[PDB]
């Protein structure tokens, strides 16, 4: 059955239990941004450090 | 500290852009000025360079930690720099630096031990030692028996209780000065002997003498000096394997 | 490591059925009958007990 | 005396050779750990054939 | 709330911009610098 | 296919199953610091600055 309107779904859905795993790559670790940050000293190019 | 409107009173720096900000105004006086991280050729010390390899060979032959060695390296460097004692054998100075560092770490090793790892006579090491004390103008510390209770008893694989009993026996003996004029080790070994003789882990004086390096008669003499108080010198927390009355005489 | 207190899908309380489950398998019951004697009739609530590995009993072997 | 050789864990020359699970847990070791690696400066190194 | 865009002040957007500069680095739709004509770059995080 | 948010290798997942412990985990991390005497005067020490 549809969850928003309670109507039946014309097709029949294939459902069953399976075994999933959670990989190591999470999103809290891959987001980063720079906007006028620290720069180097000799060549004055943007630096992270 | 400065600003065009006022002489600055305080200039904080920021982890963000990396710059110097001035809170009485917010003005970024500095602008990303701060960095946010806040052989054959050798002639000099060809012999000094080799001496520290030889320090590293000799110092850790007994497996002394690197922190001790690093100051030994720093000590020599200092002794080298003054060069007042420059006209002397390097290996003696290295060995003397080594004796000092152990004392500086509060864990001296006997010259006898230091001799084991070097060719230098105890006399020349002592001589050089004095010169370094005078050279570097620094004081030293007196020896304690307990500092050698650990490894010797270890070398005999004696249990801590015997080891600790010996230490008290030694400690009580020195507080009472039962053995005036004597080196700490000879007195300690006899205490260890007495202790070992107060446990099942008895050993012959010659074996102990062999481990400490002292003469078997010197222990025998030192024993004669501590024997009058053998019973009372023991710690209150002890379990005899042999009555003090049954303690042997020599 | 320890039995969850609620089935992830229904929400039915499971965390109080682990000792009774071991007690029924203790005597002679098959896993199919022990799960019926407890009242677990949806196959989402039977997966909870049927596929649980109890690691807490092996971390109690290390002295505190 | 000559020198010191590293020791592969769970060998015949390790301190864990032939122990029972009641003693492996008493030294804070895992009875399921396979062994076969060296401990060199804290790290755990493994040799590739 | 980290990347910025420098917006010149004109009598068409003076009120909106001073409203934005009232709230700085704490509310999200804010601002974090003022660059006056002299080149003076003041920081809103430290201004009392 | 439910609402288009699982197209091209994605998954829709139940929010009120995540609230009952589904695929929850923890994350540890260690840091080292070592006090050192690099020189005869330059010396480090742990203290409250
Ligand atoms: Zn200012
Ligand atoms: Zn359920």
UniProtKB/Swiss-Prot annotation, chain B:
PANTHER family attached to this UniProt entry: TRANSCRIPTION INITIATION FACTOR IIB, TRANSCRIPTION INITIATION FACTOR IIB-RELATED
Q: Please describe, based on the UniProt annotation, the reported consequence of changing residue 123 to E.
A: Inhibits interaction with SSU72. Reduces interaction with SSU72. Inhibits interaction with VP16. Inhibits RNA pol II transcription activation induced by VP16 but does not affect basal transcription
Annotated phenotype, changing residue 87 to Q: Decreases BREd-dependent pre-initiation complex formation
Cited function:
General transcription factor that plays a role in transcription initiation by RNA polymerase II (Pol II). Involved in the pre-initiation complex (PIC) formation and Pol II recruitment at promoter DNA. Together with the TATA box-bound TBP forms the core initiation complex and provides a bridge between TBP and the Pol II-TFIIF complex. Released from the PIC early following the onset of transcription during the initiation and elongation transition and reassociates with TBP during the next transcription cycle. Associates with chromatin to core promoter-specific regions.
In Gene Ontology terms, what is a biological process of this protein?
DNA-templated transcription initiation
- Domain description from the entry? The TFIIB-type zinc-binding domain is necessary for the interaction and recruitment of RNA polymerase II to the core promoter, the formation of a fully competent pre-initiation complex (PIC) assembly and basal transcription initiation. The C-terminus is necessary and sufficient for interaction with the TATA box-bound TBP complex and for the formation of PIC.
Variant or mutagenesis effect after changing residue 25 to S:
Does not inhibit interaction with TBP. Inhibits the recruitment of RNA polymerase II into the initiation complex
Protein known as:
Transcription initiation factor IIB
User: What is the E.C. number?
Assistant: 2.3.1.48
> Its quaternary structure?
Found in a ternary complex with TATA box-bound TBP. Part of a TFIID-containing RNA polymerase II pre-initiation complex (PIC) that is composed of TBP and at least GTF2A1, GTF2A2, GTF2E1, GTF2E2, GTF2F1, GTF2H2, GTF2H3, GTF2H4, GTF2H5, GTF2B, TCEA1, ERCC2, ERCC3, TAF1, TAF2, TAF3, TAF4, TAF5, TAF6, TAF7, TAF8, TAF9, TAF10, TAF11, TAF12 and TAF13. Associates with TFIID-TFIIA (DA complex) to form TFIID-TFIIA-TFIIB (DAB complex), which is then recognized by RNA polymerase II (Pol II). Found in a RNA polymerase II initiation complex.
> Per the record, what is the consequence of mutating residue 66 to Q?
In a colorectal cancer sample; somatic mutation
Species per Swiss-Prot/TrEMBL record? Homo sapiens (Human)
Query: Where does tissue-level expression of this protein occur?
Result: Expressed in the inner cell mass forming the embryoblast. Not detected in cells from the outer thin layer trophoblast (at protein level).
> Where does the record place it?
Nucleus; Chromosome
Q: What is the effect of changing residue 119 to L?
A: Reduces interaction with VP16
Chain positions of all zinc fingers (TFIIB-type): 1-30
Q: Which residues bind DNA?
A: 86, 88, 123, 130, 182, 206, 215, 218, 220, 224
Keywords (alphabetical) are: Acetylation, Acyltransferase, Chromosome, DNA-binding, Host-virus interaction, Metal-binding, Nucleus, Phosphoprotein, Repeat, Transcription, Transcription regulation, Transferase, Zinc, Zinc-finger
Task: Enumerate the residue ranges of region (Necessary for TATA box-bound TBP complex formation).
Answer: 178-250
Curated annotation (Swiss-Prot), chain E:
Domain of life of the source: Eukaryota
- Coiled-coil annotation reads none
What are the subcellular locations of this protein?
Answer: Nucleus; Cytoplasm; Chromosome
Q: How is it modified after translation?
A: The tandem heptapeptide repeats in the C-terminal domain (CTD) can be highly phosphorylated. The phosphorylation activates Pol II. Phosphorylation occurs mainly at residues 'Ser-2' and 'Ser-5' of the heptapeptide repeat and is mediated, at least, by CDK7 and CDK9. POLR2A associated with DNA is specifically phosphorylated at 'Ser-5' of the CTD by CDK7, promoting transcription initiation by triggering dissociation from DNA. Phosphorylated at 'Ser-2', Ser-5' and 'Ser-7' of the CTD by CDK9 (P-TEFb complex), promoting transcription elongation.
Q: Could you say which protein family the record assigns here?
A: Belongs to the RNA polymerase beta' chain family.
Quote the record's domain comment: The C-terminal domain (CTD) serves as a platform for assembly of factors that regulate transcription initiation, elongation, termination and mRNA processing.
Question: What job does this protein perform?
Answer: Catalytic core component of RNA polymerase II (Pol II), a DNA-dependent RNA polymerase which synthesizes mRNA precursors and many functional non-coding RNAs using the four ribonucleoside triphosphates as substrates. Pol II-mediated transcription cycle proceeds through transcription initiation, transcription elongation and transcription termination stages.
Complex formation:
Component of the RNA polymerase II (Pol II) core complex consisting of 12 subunits: a ten-subunit catalytic core composed of POLR2A/RPB1, POLR2B/RPB2, POLR2C/RPB3, POLR2I/RPB9, POLR2J/RPB11, POLR2E/RPABC1, POLR2F/RPABC2, POLR2H/RPABC3, POLR2K/RPABC4 and POLR2L/RPABC5 and a mobile stalk composed of two subunits POLR2D/RPB4 and POLR2G/RPB7, protruding from the core and functioning primarily in transcription initiation. Part of Pol II(G) complex, in which Pol II core associates with an additional subunit POLR2M; unlike conventional Pol II, Pol II(G) functions as a transcriptional repressor.
The disease this record links to the protein is: Neurodevelopmental disorder with hypotonia and variable intellectual and behavioral abnormalities: An autosomal dominant neurodevelopmental disorder characterized by profound infantile-onset hypotonia, developmental delay with poor speech, delayed walking, and impaired intellectual development. Additional variable features include feeding difficulties, dysmorphic features, and visual defects.
Protein name per Swiss-Prot or TrEMBL: DNA-directed RNA polymerase II subunit RPB1
Q: To which species is this protein native?
A: Homo sapiens
| Gene name of this polypeptide | POLR2A
Task: Show which stretch of the intact protein is covered.
Answer: 386 to 433 of 1970
């Amino acid at each position: 059955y549809n969850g928003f309107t309670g109507r039946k779904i014309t097709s029949q859905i294939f459902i069953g239990p399976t075994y999933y795993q959670r990989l190591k790559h999470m999103v809290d670790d891959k987001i980063h941004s720079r906007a006028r940050g620290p720069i180097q000293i000799l060549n004055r190019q943007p630096m992270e450090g | 500290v400065t600003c065009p409107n006022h002489p600055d009173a305080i200039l904080v720096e920021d982890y963000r852009a990396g710059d110097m900000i001035c809170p009485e105004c917010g003005l970024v006086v500095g602008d990303r000025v701060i960095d946010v991280g806040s052989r054959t050729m050798s002639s000099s010390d060809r012999a000094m360079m080799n001496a520290f390899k030889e320090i590293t060979t000799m110092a850790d032959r007994i497996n002394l930690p690197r922190n001790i060695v690093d100051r030994t390296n720093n000590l020599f460097k200092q002794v080298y720099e003054q060069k007042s004692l420059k006209g002397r054998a390097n290996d003696a100075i290295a060995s003397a630096c080594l004796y000092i560092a152990c004392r500086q770490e509060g864990v001296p090793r006997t010259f006898k031990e230091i001799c084991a790892v070097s060719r230098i006579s105890k006399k020349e090491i002592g001589r050089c030692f004095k010169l370094i004390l005078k050279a570097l103008e620094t004081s030293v510390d007196l020896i304690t028996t307990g500092d050698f209770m650990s490894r010797f008893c270890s070398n005999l694989c004696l249990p801590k209780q015997v080891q600790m009993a010996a230490t008290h026996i030694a400690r009580k003996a020195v507080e009472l000065d039962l053995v005036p004029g004597r080196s700490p080790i000879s007195v300690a070994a006899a205490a260890i002997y007495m202790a070992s003789q107060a446990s099942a882990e008895k050993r012959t004086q010659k074996e102990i003498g062999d481990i400490a390096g002292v003469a078997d008669v010197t222990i025998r003499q030192s024993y004669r000096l501590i024997y009058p108080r053998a019973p009372d010198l023991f710690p209150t927390d002890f379990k005899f394997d042999t009555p003090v009355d049954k303690l042997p005489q020599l | 490591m320890i039995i969850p207190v609620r089935c992830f899908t229904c929400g039915k309380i499971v965390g109080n059925k682990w000792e009774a489950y071991l007690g029924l398998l203790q005597a002679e019951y098959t896993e199919g009958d022990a799960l019926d004697a407890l009242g677990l009739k949806r196959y989402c609530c039977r997966r909870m007990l049927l596929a649980h590995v109890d690691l807490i009993e092996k971390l109690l072997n290390y002295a505190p | 005396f000559i020198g010191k050789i590293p020791i592969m864990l769970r060998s015949t020359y390790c301190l864990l050779n032939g122990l029972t699970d009641r003693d492996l847990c008493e030294l804070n070791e895992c009875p399921l750990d396979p062994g076969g690696y060296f401990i060199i400066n804290g790290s755990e190194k493994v040799l590739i054939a | 709330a980290n990347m910025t865009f420098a917006e010149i002040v004109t009598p068409f957007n003076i009120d909106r911009l001073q409203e934005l500069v009232r709230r700085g680095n704490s509310q999200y739709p804010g601002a974090k610098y003022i660059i006056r004509d002299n080149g003076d770059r003041i920081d809103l995080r430290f201004h009392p | 296919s439910y609402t288009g948010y699982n197209q091209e290798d994605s998954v829709i997942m139940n929010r009120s199953a995540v609230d009952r412990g589904f695929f929850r985990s923890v994350f540890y991390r260690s840091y080292k610091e070592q006090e050192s005497k690099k020189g005869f005067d330059q010396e480090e020490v742990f203290e409250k600055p």
